């Protein structure tokens, strides 16, 4: 379970700002995936440095429900990703 | 290959509790303790109580001698539980009573059955004091007489990657995670092989009767993932105390999805074979994690380091 809390902190019609808790051990980078809940499209993906605790997802569409998933990639654990849903 | 993972003492039990919770595919979990109440408290697989005659189920009193005598009294139960395994990982926090004293007995029993016997053990944090560190070092010396490979993870090394203001409780959680990643990083070559599948006989070759070992891991994303992850593993703080060209064996696990390029496997292996001695036993394989995209993990176990 890393990060241990994930939330949408701000939302606009085409973007979501997500926030998570600082990790107990060094994270090399985070992998962030997102796509429409139950979609025939592959999820889109990007990475952010392991020193971040927020990220902005842009290029979204209004009134679409999205599944967002954050992987903390660390040399020191193999913990599972955290996932949330949010409708723009 | 049949893999068993045995936690010994309270720290080893907490580590196995974490591996059961977070899951390691294809292995079978056990917990060995002199404290019967601790054995029953959490889900840790099948429980093996040792030394009920001498301890009455009340623990080892932080005394390695009692841990030894408890395990000695119950070699029959230990052998009965170990039988059938091809490989066993013995996990213990060294410096207490049960892990320090019983883990070498568990290992001796397993060695006697012909099982490939890998210990994965921690040394205590500096703040746990000099006596626990002394107990840990004596137990590691005793353990090294009866294992095939003994991987040491010094908790003092984990200190320098811990976030600031971390709770005392989360610091021990991190030790569980490293132990879990350690067992998983070796076991997955067997239980989740990729294209370059390692034969268990070659695992045995690089791990059998080698003595002390250390490991390090690296992770990376993007076009340079292979070079970056390999260099990160070799620069790992868990490996920094050894000269890799001194190891008699090197086992490498590249964890990837379905997109591994030939030149990436070439790159990792060339980097390993450059720093490894010309007479080392070198085994490099891949494992499969299908939930990776454009990323890679490299895990390096330096074996036979003296
Ligand atoms: N991984 C891990 N290690 C621990 C934990 N608690 C203690 N340790 C370490 O394990 C060492 C031995 O303590 P413990 O296992 O409780 O003693 P034992 O039951 O007598 O073997 C301690 O000195 C700590 O360095 C834990 O929850 N997880």
Task: Provide a concise account of the structure shown.
Chain A has strands at residues 6-12, 15-20, 29-36, 44-49, 54-57, 65-73, 82-87. Chain A has 88 residues and is an all-beta fold. In chain A, strands 4-3-6-7 form a four-stranded antiparallel sheet, with no helix packed on it.
Total helices of chain A: the number is: 0
Beta-strand content bin of chain B:
15-25%
CATH architecture label of the largest domain in chain B: 3-Layer(aba) Sandwich
CATH class of the largest domain in chain B: Alpha Beta
CATH topology of the largest domain in chain B: Rossmann fold
Structural class determined from secondary elements of chain A = mainly beta
Question: What integer value in Å does the Rg of chain B equal?
Answer: 19 Å
Q: How would you describe the overall organization of this protein?
A:
The PDB classes it as cell cycle. The entry lists the keywords Cell division, Monobody, GTPase, hydrolase, cell cycle. The complex is a heterodimer of chains A (88) and B (306). Chain A has one domain (1-88). Helix content of chain A is 0%, strand content 52%. Chain A has 88 residues and is mostly beta strands. Chain A starts with 5 loop residues before the first strand and ends with a strand. Chain B is α/β, with parallel strands linked by helices and 306 residues long. The relative contact order of chain B is 0.12. Chains A and B meet through loops of A and helix 9 and strand 7 of B. The complex binds guanosine-5'-diphosphate. Guanosine-5'-diphosphate (GDP) binds at residues 9-11, 14-15, 60, 62, 93, 95-99, 122, 124, 128, 132, 155, 172, 175-176, 179 of chain B.
Attribute tags:
heterodimer, A: 88 residues, mainly beta, 4-stranded antiparallel β-sheet, 3-stranded antiparallel β-sheet, 52% strand, B: 306 residues, alpha/beta, Rossmann fold, 60s Ribosomal Protein L30, Chain: A, binds guanosine-5'-diphosphate, cell division (chain B), septation (chain B)
């Amino acid at each position: 379970s890393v990060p241990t809390k994930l939330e949408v902190v701000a939302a606009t019609p085409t973007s979501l700002l997500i926030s998570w808790d600082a990790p107990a051990v060094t994270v090399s980078y985070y992998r962030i995936t997102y796509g429409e809940t139950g979609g025939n499209s592959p999820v889109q993906e990007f990475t952010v440095p392991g020193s971040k605790s927020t990220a902005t997802i842009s290029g979204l569409s209004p009134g679409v429900d999205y599944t967002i998933t954050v992987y903390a990639r660390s040399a020191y654990h193999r913990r599972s990703p955290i996932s949330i849903n949010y409708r723009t | 290959a049949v893999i068993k993972v045995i936690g010994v003492g309270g720290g080893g039990g907490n580590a196995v509790e974490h591996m059961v919770r977070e899951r390691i595919e294809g292995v079978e979990f056990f917990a060995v303790n002199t404290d019967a109440q601790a054995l029953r408290k959490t889900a840790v697989g099948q429980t093996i109580q040792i030394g009920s005659g001498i301890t009455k189920g009340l623990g080892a009193g932080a005394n390695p001698e009692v841990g030894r005598n408890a395990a000695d009294e119950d070699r029959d139960a230990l052998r009965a539980a170990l039988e059938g395994a091809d490989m066993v990982f013995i996990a213990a926090g060294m410096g207490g009573g049960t892990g320090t004293g019983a883990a070498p007995v568990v290992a001796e029993v397993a060695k006697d059955l012909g099982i490939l016997t890998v210990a994965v053990v921690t040394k205590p944090f500096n703040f746990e004091g000099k006596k626990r560190m002394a107990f840990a070092e004596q137990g590691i010396t005793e353990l090294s007489k009866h294992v095939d490979s003994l991987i040491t993870i010094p908790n003092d090394k984990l200190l320098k990657v811990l976030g600031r203001g971390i709770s005392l409780l989360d610091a021990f959680g991190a030790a569980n995670d490293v132990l879990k990643g350690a067992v998983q990083g070796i076991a997955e070559l067997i239980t989740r092989p990729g294209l370059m599948n390692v034969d268990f006989a070659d695992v045995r070759t690089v791990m059998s009767e080698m003595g002390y070992a250390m490991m390090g891991s690296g992770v990376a994303s993007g076009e340079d993932r292979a070079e970056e992850a390999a260099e990160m593993a070799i620069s790992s703080p868990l490996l920094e105390d050894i000269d890799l060209s001194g190891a008699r064996g090197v086992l490498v696990n590249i964890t990837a999805g379905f997109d591994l390029r030939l030149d990436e496997f070439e790159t990792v292996g060339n980097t390993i074979r450059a720093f490894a001695s010309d007479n080392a036993t070198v085994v490099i394989g891949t494992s499969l994690d299908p939930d990776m995209n454009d990323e890679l993990r490299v895990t390096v176990v330096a074996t036979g380091i003296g």
